[PDB]
Ligand binder design. Structure first.
Ligand SMILES: *[C@@H]1O[C@H](CO)[C@@H](O[C@@H]2O[C@H](CO)[C@@H](O[C@@H]3O[C@H](CO[C@H]4O[C@H](CO[C@H]5O[C@H](CO)[C@@H](O)[C@H](O)[C@@H]5O[C@H]5O[C@H](CO)[C@@H](O)[C@H](O)[C@@H]5O)[C@@H](O)[C@H](O[C@H]5O[C@H](CO)[C@@H](O)[C@H](O)[C@@H]5O)[C@@H]4O)[C@@H](O)[C@H](O[C@H]4O[C@H](CO)[C@@H](O)[C@H](O)[C@@H]4O[C@@H]4O[C@H](CO)[C@@H](O)[C@H](O)[C@@H]4O[C@@H]4O[C@H](CO)[C@@H](O)[C@H](O)[C@@H]4O)[C@@H]3O)[C@H](O)[C@H]2NC(C)=O)[C@H](O)[C@H]1NC(C)=O
Ligand SMILES: *[C@@H]1O[C@H](CO)[C@@H](O[C@@H]2O[C@H](CO)[C@@H](O[C@@H]3O[C@H](CO[C@H]4O[C@H](CO)[C@@H](O)[C@H](O[C@H]5O[C@H](CO)[C@@H](O)[C@H](O)[C@@H]5O)[C@@H]4O)[C@@H](O)[C@H](O[C@H]4O[C@H](CO)[C@@H](O)[C@H](O)[C@@H]4O)[C@@H]3O)[C@H](O)[C@H]2NC(C)=O)[C@H](O)[C@H]1NC(C)=O
Ligand code: PIO
Ligand code: PIO
Ligand SMILES: *[C@@H]1O[C@H](CO)[C@@H](O[C@@H]2O[C@H](CO)[C@@H](O)[C@H](O)[C@H]2NC(C)=O)[C@H](O)[C@H]1NC(C)=O
Ligand code: D10
Ligand code: D10
Ligand code: CL
Lengths: 332, 349, 340, 349, 340
């Protein structure tokens, strides 16, 4: 009854084609974001999924009303009846609002004309990853949003006190990454259609090491140690040490292709590539070590090369591991 | 015929579907029940599950009372878009589907007292966080939470139609699970607090236990057979260096392929699972059996084996290694003990 | 004459209430159904579903649409279907479906003078059918389409197959790469939910899996590797490097045969018929390798210290040359008789 | 401005787009032609193919005659939804897209006599049933059938705009085939029967021949080299038992991997392709080489090879196996003969 | 203020005919276009396409939308684009595309006092380019984006790049993990079809594939395996098991290297530059294994009967120690000069 009359009075003569204060001042929009979950990080596509409750608040003097009712708590029905900012996410690869069982949107109008607009979003956001330190890499994946058509002279966004909120991180789908922290910034980006106020959230992410230690580092280390068993086998066992030497190289070839299967086909050398390549050099050199020993003893000090290899090979791999892990875990 | 057209016209004449029933006067109470027509597959990679439901909602709306030759109007689902319905959404819902074939899979029924029945057929994809430390002997409680998106608990409250246990019903033949068992469901309700107010949330937890049969056949048995195969080389003579080297290297490489192929089903989690520990210990047993032979070969003096016609005076011939003799007992015993400890650790818990 | 048709159609839709079924408040409206199956494909054991494309026709009578003076059956533009009441037909086991929309929505409306409506739709549906894979790949599957009214109970609507057993056509022309449709069956019953009893039509197909693919892919490679492992029994006991390498690789090769087969099937918690064969063939290659280790141990372990004799390695090898081929054929005899 | 607005308003005033032109007077005759902008990839596994077309239709509507400053009204696509258009659909289509980026890719043109031109950009995914017995040297005629969905041949008939061979035109640069050659298209017309009457069908068959280049590189050449590799062991001395056994076993393992991996992109058909026959015979040649050596090894009297010093008359030494000497000729000859028969059989089909 | 603006905008749309283009029945309307590229991703050789995100802006003058008295460029809510004529621009090679719709449809309409309309869209399009992979992975592709009017011919509409060479921005900020964008250029031309001549704008990029990924994954593993097959040349000819195991493993390893690369590419019928190298490395490791068989046959097959000597077994091994590293270096010298 009375609420129907108020709603009809607000929309009588209302033109939702016009931004509030269209020729007076810019529209100030206060934005909030509640992160329900930061989904998986897709390194191959350089993207991540984030589920947010995106809240916007502005003032529309055309929506003022006087009554005992201090606020109109409404569903999504009136969202298309009033003016709504054309907020979009600038690095969104693919985004979708939710529609089950109804459009997950909220509209609340106060008697002073203040409008609160909230909706639930899932966003596949672009995040360019520098994988040089992979799998010990750290990233700060952004999430930028602005107005699509209204420049800085027409729409201005502004972070509130509790800008970005994150819930129970333990329920998130960050399998290989840990959420470290977030920052929210404001800037003006100049395009060809004008200057736009762009709001960004950066999510710092550190890769968890455990998966690639199990998947690659431990298998590659064991094949390197496997190649050292040849050094303690009698040099007269030509088929035994040749088969042992060549199968480790074959296995190290198989591990190399598996290691990069989870990455984009970047053309620089990651920390994973360096470890695999050095492990390739160790298994390669062990077979060459026996070939030299076999040639100089049978197919003929050099004869004592096995005793040297029993120490030099384990010490060089320990030394390389000490340098490799220190440089990539504490250095640059 | 026109009698019912005038009733429907009168119901919508002056009706405002922007306003909930009892607005400014009371709290809209929505009765809810779920009929699970199928419990779809659980996706380990996405940590989510699929579920096809009849999502039934019921509430009172005095604006839709009528008097006519019928007590219930069983109307086309086109009518539901003209009236206020609850804005229920799934809190942990991912991309869900409202079925539209061949028509919107919704029903609306209006009784003469104003009570509304509003059910829809939905394919719901909901997040199910998983702790895979016990995989493949893990169990999960996959939640399904829903409530009003826009109306706080002072405006819309949800209740179950019947006793909470009997308000979520699963069809007898609806199980679409392949590697899980539906032990049962727990039904509850509560309040969720946000920055925009307090909201009623309705919760259902489905309890799923993974079935280990697939992983026994494809992972555990090949691992166990590989470890048994690696201990075969203990019984060969110490002079069969190429033969006993092929035993050790092939089984080590086989365990390497098994370990890498084992996690292809799982999401790339950063912790070790129960299967990873079994494979790691199997790797240690296989690796040690090759390391055992290297120690045996280090103490092998002569390059020729016993010719079969000479008595060893305990030319001369190498003796049977004491390391080989002890490994014939120690390795099967330790691996048998590990299996006892491993299975009792996880099957009992 | 064309102006008379336009006037007649406008008269039908004037005062028509799309919210009300025919005979609203009266006897249930009877809906007759026919299906012309265009194709069946994508029968997935991984997803436990099949994809079905069909021409789906519904046949009911709406007395509000009776017209006189036109001795013709009015075929109208399919957009008129949005101005008429149509049954809320849905498929219960439907996972993902769509009405084709090229070039326009593949929908037919044909009115008849007495008020009969023919409503046709070209539908591609991916329906669910859980498959018992215990006898896979020598299994027969039964996959159904459950047709039901969503909002109307048996008091408001009744389904029936129009034409009896001839309601569904085109099944005999369906060609599946991996299946042959043994038969199809039409069922009409009622299903009760908490909201009432609803009419249901069930169309079911019995699918028998062709085994010709799996002979080339799984069975023959497994048989040949098992036969290959018997070559060791003709090699001398002292050739340890040769017989171990032959025995080890065949054991390894069996895993390679199994992993490829595993990758193309769902996570099944029970043993399939194909699993029994692979595990049977793995035992034979494993025992053939264990046969040499026993032979090697007898000669080199128990030699210096001084059913076959179990002391002459030549006897054990010659015993193996007969028993191993004979037992494997016995296993194949029992296996193929039980699953055929 | 207002001159052309008044014309369009007059045309649509009293116009019923539910009624086909000539309903109750004649048959609506629709002239059709197709311009193929790209013949997209063929999917063997799904037995389908993709095609991108400018699908053009033309028919006469006497309700749309006009007189004005222009003889042809080139209007945007939203006018097409205001008038009657044919309900054309593709009989063998699976999932077709009518593109609408950035606007509906449709054009409507009305001439003063009432003739309408109505073209749309479509991406059709159509069924192409395949017989793969001759794979990978097979050829297929992929059909593209279309016609009216609801109107029978007594109401709507379709005809080609020009000579039927010239009414389907493929663009010179429009070829997205990777492993097929488009050799041409045959264009025909016919009548189909259904439960609702007789319908005109317009048919196009696209004649595709598979390009064998990929399968020669990835399957045929590795198989031929494995067979040649397996016969290398015939030239090794009969006392190299571990060496020649590794030759036989590894080549069999390689042939098993090749045989299993060679049907990855094909539907799981129940028959044998030409590739499957080639791999079977290649497997038999590889398998028989290891059987050949086992026969040779069964008659090796001595475990030691020739020492390089002692004369061999005709201590004692084994002689070169007669089975080996015949195998060094028979095996290469029988494989060469099989290839001559195999390639003459299928390259001539 | 706001009353006048609302009065003005309502005046523009009153009597506006969206069915008629600007200057309908008169001169062609000139439409200028600017593109700001957000990113390029999913450059797929398997699917022969690339995915492009861009801000697609169109510039034209509609004198029916001229307004006076308001010294402002009116940015209206993007739903007004449904009430205005806009060019029917389409992308000929566009396989699949969408306008982004979060939080609203990513669309902009900005009016100007003289009647000029700025219409921007944020579009992600998967456009097809057929790639010539004969030089893969050292290939240089050229992927385009055809921009055309569908229903309006050059008599009705004209296209041009607004800003000439500056019409497309953001190309220098694109980071493709596998390619580097060497150059982009803009082309304007007309295309003739059976229905008329239509204006076409063409934007094309030249993508040069990076080689560093393939050095680590395909080239270095092949070189190391080829070098390790030469180790058998320093092994004693008596060690048949050692040299056959070394020879067989490298041949088997080369196949495994090729299968991993094979599975991530389309089924093109020609030989790629990577295939030429892998075939070359296969020949080298195959001939090394064949080198021992010749050595084995000379010592044992012809020894009792009794440029390298071809009768001295050790002479052949010495010859192979020099020729194989030399010829492989010659093969690498020719291969890399031809493709770099
Ligand atoms: C190329 O062509 C394609 C099509 O081939 C085209 O895509 C189409 O784009 C148009 C827009 O241009 C879409 O139309 C709008 O869609 C809006 C929502 O879109 C989202 O939801 C879609 C499904 O919606 C269903 O469910 C919701 C609730 O969950 C319901 O509101 C809808 O009506 C609809 O329900 C029907 O279907 C369900 C089953 O699905 C049934 O159960 C139900 O019974 C009913 O039959 C979904 O499909 C969309 O996904 C697409 O788009 C996303 C990107 O956004 C993409 O990621 C996906 O992949 C996919 O492509 C999407 O999620 C909808 O709100 C609009 O409806 C408005 O406006 C129309 C205007 O005519 C009006 O008629 C409606 O009543 C409604 O009025 C609004 O509603 C507002 C809601 O917030 C409200 O605030 C307003 O106040 C007003 O409310 C009403 O107003 C009326 C009038 O005053 C009043 O009487 C009422 O009482 C009430 O107050 C509109 O439908 C269309 O859906 C797209 N189709 C497809 C297949 O994608 C594409 O754009 C073209 N491209 C180009 C470049 O041209
Ligand atoms: C795939 O698997 C599915 C699932 O198992 C198979 O579907 C089943 O097919 C069989 C065979 O066609 C069905 O049995 C038949 O059902 C019909 C219909 O029954 C309904 O309508 C009757 C009136 O026409 C009505 O009387 C029935 O009610 C009685 O039965 C129900 C059964 O639960 C009982 O609850 C009631 O109280 C009644 O007693 C019911 O509403 C029926 O007409 C058939 O009767 C024939 O056979 C019986 C003997 O069985 C005989 O007495 C009759 O004279 C007559 O000859 C028959 O019962 C079954 O209903 C289907 N079930 C489902 C769930 O769909 C499917 O066939 C499989 N496919 C293939 C290819 O094999
Ligand atoms: C993981 C493996 C760790 C291995 C650790 C191995 C640690 C270690 O150094 O062992 C040496 C010894 C080797 O015994 P093994 O029987 O293998 O070797 C014999 C031994 O060396 C004799 O002393 C030799 O006789 P001799 O008098 O020299 O003439 C004999 O020569 P011959 O008879 O041919 O003429 C050799 O064959 O092993 C143990 O005593 C078992 C300890 C427990 C081993 C427990 C192993 C589990
Ligand atoms: C798959 C083929 C299966 C063939 C099965 C063939 C089964 C079969 O009967 O083999 C016997 C014989 C073995 O030939 P092979 O040369 O290998 O064996 C020699 C033969 O046994 C001589 O008789 C021995 O001399 P002796 O007199 O004892 O002093 C000689 O001893 P030594 O000189 O070494 O000390 C042996 O080496 O082969 C054929 O005659 C070729 C048949 C056609 C072969 C056709 C092959 C295509
Ligand atoms: C997000 O932005 C808000 C401002 O919108 C930041 O809050 C400000 O923090 C500074 C700290 O020196 C205070 O002086 C301001 O008064 C704060 N503004 C408020 C509360 O409105 C907040 O720190 C930002 N979050 C980041 C950068 O992580
Ligand atoms: C070409 C690589 C050869 C490796 C073995 C060399 C053995 C002899 C060294 C003098
Ligand atoms: C790292 C490989 C070790 C193999 C056994 C060595 C035993 C040495 C005993 C002195
Ligand atoms: Cl193709």
């Amino acid at each position: 009854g009375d609420v129907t009359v108020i709603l009809n009075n607000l929309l009588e003569g209302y033109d939702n084609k016009l931004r509030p204060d269209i020729g007076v001042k810019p529209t100030l929009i206060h934005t909030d974001m509640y992160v329900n979950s930061i989904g998986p990080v897709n390194a191959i596509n350089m993207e991540y999924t984030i589920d947010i409750f995106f809240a916007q608040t502005w003032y529309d003097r055309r929506l003022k009303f006087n009554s005992t009712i201090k606020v109109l708590r409404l569903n999504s029905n009136m969202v298309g009846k009033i003016w709504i900012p054309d907020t979009f996410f600038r690095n969104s690869k693919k985004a979708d609002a939710h529609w089950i069982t109804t459009p997950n949107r909220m509209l609340r109008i106060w008697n002073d004309g203040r409008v609160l607009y909230t909706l639930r979003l899932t966003i596949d956001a672009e995040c360019q990853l520098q994988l040089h330190n992979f799998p010990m890499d750290e990233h700060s994946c952004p999430l930028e949003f602005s107005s699509y058509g209204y420049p800085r002279e027409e729409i201005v966004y502004q972070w509130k006190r509790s800008s970005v909120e994150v819930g129970d991180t333990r329920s998130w789908r960050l399998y290989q990454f840990s959420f470290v922290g977030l920052r929210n910034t404001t800037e003006v980006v100049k395009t060809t259609s004008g200057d736009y106020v762009v709001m960004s959230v950066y999510f710092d992410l550190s890769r968890r090491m455990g998966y690639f230690t199990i998947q690659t580092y431990i298998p590659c280390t064991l094949i390197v140690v496997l190649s050292w068993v040849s050094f303690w086998i009698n040099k007269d066992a030509v088929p035994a040490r040749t088969s042992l030497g060549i199968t480790t190289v074959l296995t190290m070839t198989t591990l190399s292709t598996i290691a990069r299967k989870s990455l984009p086909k970047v053309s620089y050398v990651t920390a994973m590539d360096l470890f695999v390549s050095v492990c390739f050099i160790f298994v390669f050199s062990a077979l060459v070590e026996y070939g030299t020993l076999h040639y100089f003893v049978s197919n003929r000090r050099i004869a004592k090369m096995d005793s040297y290899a029993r120490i030099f090979f384990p010490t060089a791999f320990c030394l390389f591991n000490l340098v490799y892990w220190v440089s990539y875990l504490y250095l640059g | 015929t026109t009698v019912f057209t005038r009733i429907l016209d009168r119901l919508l004449d002056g009706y405002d579907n922007r306003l909930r029933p009892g607005l400014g006067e009371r709290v809209t109470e929505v009765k809810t029940d779920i009929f699970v027509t199928s419990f779809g597959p659980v996706s380990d990679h996405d940590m989510e599950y699929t579920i096809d439901v009849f999502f039934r909602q019921s509430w009172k709306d005095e604006r839709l009372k009528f008097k006519g030759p019928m007590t219930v109007l069983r109307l086309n689902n086109l009518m539901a878009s003209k009236i206020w319905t609850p804005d229920t959404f799934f809190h942990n819902g991912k991309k869900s589907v409202a079925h539209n074939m061949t028509m919107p899979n919704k029903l609306l029924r209006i009784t003469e007292d104003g009570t509304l029945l509003y059910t829809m057929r939905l394919t719901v994809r909901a997040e199910c966080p998983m702790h895979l430390e016990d995989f493949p002997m893990d169990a999960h409680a996959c939640p399904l939470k829903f409530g009003s998106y826009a109306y706080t608990r002072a405006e819309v409250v949800y209740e179950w139609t019947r006793e909470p246990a009997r308000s979520v019903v699963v069809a007898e033949d609806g199980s679409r699970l392949n590697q899980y068992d539906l032990l049962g469901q727990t039904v509850d309700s509560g309040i969720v607090q946000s920055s925009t107010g307090e909201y009623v949330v309705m919760t259902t937890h489905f309890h799923l236990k993974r079935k280990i049969g697939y992983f026994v056949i494809q992972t555990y048995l090949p691992c166990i057979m590989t470890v048994i195969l690696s201990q075969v080389s203990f019984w060969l003579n110490r002079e069969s260096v190429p033969a006993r080297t092929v035993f050790g290297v092939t089984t080590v490489l086989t365990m390497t392929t098994l370990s890498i192929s084992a996690r292809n089903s799982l999401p790339k989690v950063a912790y070790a699972t129960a299967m990873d520990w079994f494979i790691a210990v199997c790797y240690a047993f296989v690796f040690s059996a090759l390391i055992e032979f290297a120690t045996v070969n280090y103490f092998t003096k002569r390059g020729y084996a016993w010719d079969g016609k000479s008595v060893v005076p305990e030319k001369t011939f190498n003796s049977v290694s004491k390391i080989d003799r002890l490994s014939r007992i120690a390795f099967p015993l330790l691996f048998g003990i590990f299996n006892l400890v491993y299975w009792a650790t996880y099957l009992n818990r | 004459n064309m102006s008379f048709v336009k006037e007649t159609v406008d008269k039908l839709l004037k005062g028509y209430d799309i919210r009300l079924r025919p005979d609203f408040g009266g006897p249930p409206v009877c809906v007759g159904m026919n299906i012309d199956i265009a194709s069946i494909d994508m029968v997935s054991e991984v997803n436990m579903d099949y994809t079905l494309t069909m021409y789906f026709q519904q046949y009911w009578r709406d007395k509000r649409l009776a017209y006189s003076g036109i001795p013709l059956n009015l075929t109208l533009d399919n957009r008129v279907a949005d101005q008429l009441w149509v049954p809320d037909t849905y498929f219960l086991n439907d996972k993902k479906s769509f009405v084709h929309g090229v070039t326009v929505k593949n929908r037919m409306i044909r009115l008849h003078p007495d008020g009969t409506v023919l409503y046709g739709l070209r539908i591609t549906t991916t329906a669910a059918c859980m498959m018992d894979l215990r006898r896979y790949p020598l299994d027969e599957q039964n996959c159904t389409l459950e047709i039901e009214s969503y909002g109307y109970t048996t008091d408001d609507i009744e389904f029936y197959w129009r034409g009896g057993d001839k309601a569904v056509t085109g099944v005999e022309r369906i060609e599946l790469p991996q299946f042959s449709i043994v038969e199809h069956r039409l069922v009409s019953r009622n299903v009760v939910f908490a909201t009432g009893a609803y009419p249901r039509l069930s169309l079911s197909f019995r699918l028998k899996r062709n085994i010709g693919y799996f002979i080339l892919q799984t069975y023959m490679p497994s048989i040949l590797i098992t036969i290959l492992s018997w070559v060791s029994f003709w090699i001398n006991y002292d050739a340890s490097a040769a017989r171990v390498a032959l025995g080890i690789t065949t054991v390894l090769t069996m895993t390679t045969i199994n992993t490829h087969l595993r990758e193309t099937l769902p996570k099944i918690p029970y043993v399939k018929a194909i699993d029994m064969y692979l595990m049977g063939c793995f035992v034979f290659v494993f025992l053939a390798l264990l046969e040499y280790a026993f032979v090697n141990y007898i000669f080199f372990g128990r030699g210096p210290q001084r059913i076959p004799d179990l002391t002459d390695v030549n006897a054990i090898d010659r015993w193996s040359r007969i028993v191993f081929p004979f037992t494997f054929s016995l296993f194949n005899l029992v296996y193929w008789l039980y699953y055929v």
